[PDB]
Amino acid sequence: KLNVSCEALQKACKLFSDIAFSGFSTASGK
Amino acid sequence: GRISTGSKSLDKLLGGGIETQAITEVFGEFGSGKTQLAHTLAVMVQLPPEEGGLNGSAMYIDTENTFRPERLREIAQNRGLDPDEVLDNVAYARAFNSNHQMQLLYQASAMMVESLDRPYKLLIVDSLTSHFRSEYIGRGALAERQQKLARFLRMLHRLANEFDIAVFVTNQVATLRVYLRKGKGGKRIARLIGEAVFSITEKGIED
Ligand SMILES: *CCc1nc(CC*)nc(N(C)CC(=O)O)n1
């Protein structure tokens, strides 16, 4: 499982501003 | 820099291979080597520049049940790499529908900004129009279909330049376009929109 912090996530919302689901995991299932 | 494809003739056609801050879009049918090239690139990007890589991690968004981690191990092992480390440096997310695909990009962006040590340097989308073409049917739905696809494409270009990553996507019949076709047995030919011939092998894609 590959998780991401709410701080990093809210920065990405600013990036796509002018424009829960399953996320990502490694090819080894983590 | 540029991510090498493993095929010296294909790298020549692309001018040093696929490039960051750009979107390379391959076209063709089942067996032309679109997914085969995508799995190879996911391994290549992990190598240092002398080998044809960028010392980076990869992201694979799958929308057509094409992801095979066994092949990644096969390529990495044959190319002289720890297939256990290669597998750890490939993030994967199966998109279930168009909306999931769009949301996965935010997840990718956030993971990319954190990665900035092996930072993510390649994003693979296979396929790209599958969900869009399977959910929006007819002329009356074409306007919304073209709009969503254009929005996704805009988000993709944004990440490519924002995090200096390379975006490789697949499609069937703004971006750097390539067409793939089958040839002599396992041999495949690539043509830009003049031609290069590569072969699918145990090490992935090569002359
Ligand atoms: C960046 C988009 C986003 N992510 C989160 C979680 C970090 N939360 C928001 N909000 C607007 C807060 C909320 O749920 O009310 N937006």
Side-chain angles (χ1 to χ4, degrees), chain A residues 5-14, chain B residues 106:
Chain A
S5 61
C6 201
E7 184 170 279
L9 177 66
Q10 287 201 347
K11 290 191 290 288
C13 294
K14 305 171 181 80
Chain B
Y106 297 75

Short mmCIF file of all heavy atoms in Angstrom, two decimals, chain A residues 5-14, chain B residues 106, ligand 1:
data_model
loop_
_atom_site.label_atom_id
_atom_site.label_comp_id
_atom_site.label_asym_id
_atom_site.label_seq_id
_atom_site.Cartn_x
_atom_site.Cartn_y
_atom_site.Cartn_z
N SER A 5 0.27 11.75 2.52
CA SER A 5 -0.14 12.68 3.57
C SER A 5 -1.17 13.70 3.09
O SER A 5 -1.11 14.13 1.94
CB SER A 5 1.07 13.42 4.12
OG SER A 5 1.71 14.18 3.11
N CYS A 6 -2.07 14.13 3.98
CA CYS A 6 -3.07 15.13 3.62
C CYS A 6 -2.45 16.48 3.24
O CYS A 6 -3.07 17.24 2.48
CB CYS A 6 -4.13 15.28 4.70
SG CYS A 6 -5.68 16.01 4.11
N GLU A 7 -1.23 16.76 3.71
CA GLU A 7 -0.53 17.97 3.33
C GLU A 7 -0.15 17.87 1.85
O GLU A 7 -0.51 18.74 1.07
CB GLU A 7 0.71 18.20 4.21
CG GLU A 7 1.42 19.51 3.92
CD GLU A 7 2.50 19.91 4.90
OE1 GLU A 7 2.16 20.45 5.98
OE2 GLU A 7 3.69 19.69 4.59
N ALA A 8 0.49 16.77 1.46
CA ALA A 8 0.85 16.57 0.03
C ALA A 8 -0.40 16.52 -0.85
O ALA A 8 -0.33 17.02 -1.99
CB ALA A 8 1.68 15.32 -0.12
N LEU A 9 -1.50 15.96 -0.34
CA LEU A 9 -2.71 15.80 -1.15
C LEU A 9 -3.33 17.16 -1.41
O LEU A 9 -3.73 17.45 -2.54
CB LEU A 9 -3.72 14.86 -0.48
CG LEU A 9 -5.05 14.71 -1.23
CD1 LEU A 9 -4.85 14.02 -2.56
CD2 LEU A 9 -6.06 13.96 -0.42
N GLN A 10 -3.41 18.01 -0.38
CA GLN A 10 -3.99 19.34 -0.54
C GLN A 10 -3.14 20.24 -1.44
O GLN A 10 -3.70 21.08 -2.14
CB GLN A 10 -4.32 20.00 0.81
CG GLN A 10 -5.55 19.32 1.44
CD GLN A 10 -6.28 20.13 2.49
OE1 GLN A 10 -5.80 21.15 3.00
NE2 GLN A 10 -7.48 19.66 2.85
N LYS A 11 -1.83 19.98 -1.52
CA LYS A 11 -0.98 20.76 -2.46
C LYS A 11 -1.36 20.39 -3.90
O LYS A 11 -1.39 21.30 -4.75
CB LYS A 11 0.50 20.50 -2.19
CG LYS A 11 1.04 21.10 -0.90
CD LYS A 11 2.54 21.04 -0.79
CE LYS A 11 3.08 19.64 -0.60
NZ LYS A 11 2.80 19.14 0.77
N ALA A 12 -1.65 19.11 -4.16
CA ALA A 12 -2.01 18.64 -5.50
C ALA A 12 -3.36 19.21 -5.97
O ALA A 12 -3.57 19.37 -7.17
CB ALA A 12 -2.04 17.13 -5.55
N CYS A 13 -4.26 19.52 -5.03
CA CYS A 13 -5.55 20.11 -5.36
C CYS A 13 -5.37 21.55 -5.86
O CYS A 13 -6.11 21.98 -6.73
CB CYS A 13 -6.50 20.04 -4.17
SG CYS A 13 -6.97 18.35 -3.71
N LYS A 14 -4.37 22.27 -5.32
CA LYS A 14 -4.03 23.62 -5.75
C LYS A 14 -3.51 23.56 -7.19
O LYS A 14 -3.86 24.41 -8.00
CB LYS A 14 -2.94 24.22 -4.85
CG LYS A 14 -3.28 24.22 -3.37
CD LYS A 14 -2.07 24.63 -2.53
CE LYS A 14 -2.35 24.61 -1.04
NZ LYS A 14 -2.26 23.25 -0.45
N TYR B 106 -4.51 12.96 -9.23
CA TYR B 106 -4.23 13.72 -7.99
C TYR B 106 -3.35 12.85 -7.08
O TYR B 106 -2.32 13.35 -6.58
CB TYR B 106 -5.51 14.09 -7.25
CG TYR B 106 -6.44 15.02 -8.00
CD1 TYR B 106 -7.22 14.56 -9.05
CD2 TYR B 106 -6.59 16.34 -7.62
CE1 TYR B 106 -8.08 15.39 -9.73
CE2 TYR B 106 -7.44 17.19 -8.29
CZ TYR B 106 -8.20 16.72 -9.35
OH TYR B 106 -9.05 17.56 -10.02
C1 LIG C 1 -6.83 18.58 -1.94
C2 LIG C 1 -8.29 18.23 -1.88
C3 LIG C 1 -8.77 17.95 -0.48
N1 LIG C 1 -8.20 16.93 0.17
C4 LIG C 1 -8.60 16.81 1.44
C5 LIG C 1 -7.86 15.82 2.29
C6 LIG C 1 -6.43 16.21 2.52
N2 LIG C 1 -9.52 17.57 2.06
C7 LIG C 1 -10.02 18.56 1.29
N3 LIG C 1 -10.93 19.43 1.85
C8 LIG C 1 -11.52 20.53 1.09
C9 LIG C 1 -11.33 19.32 3.25
C10 LIG C 1 -12.68 18.64 3.48
O1 LIG C 1 -12.74 17.40 3.21
O2 LIG C 1 -13.63 19.33 3.93
N4 LIG C 1 -9.69 18.79 0.00
#
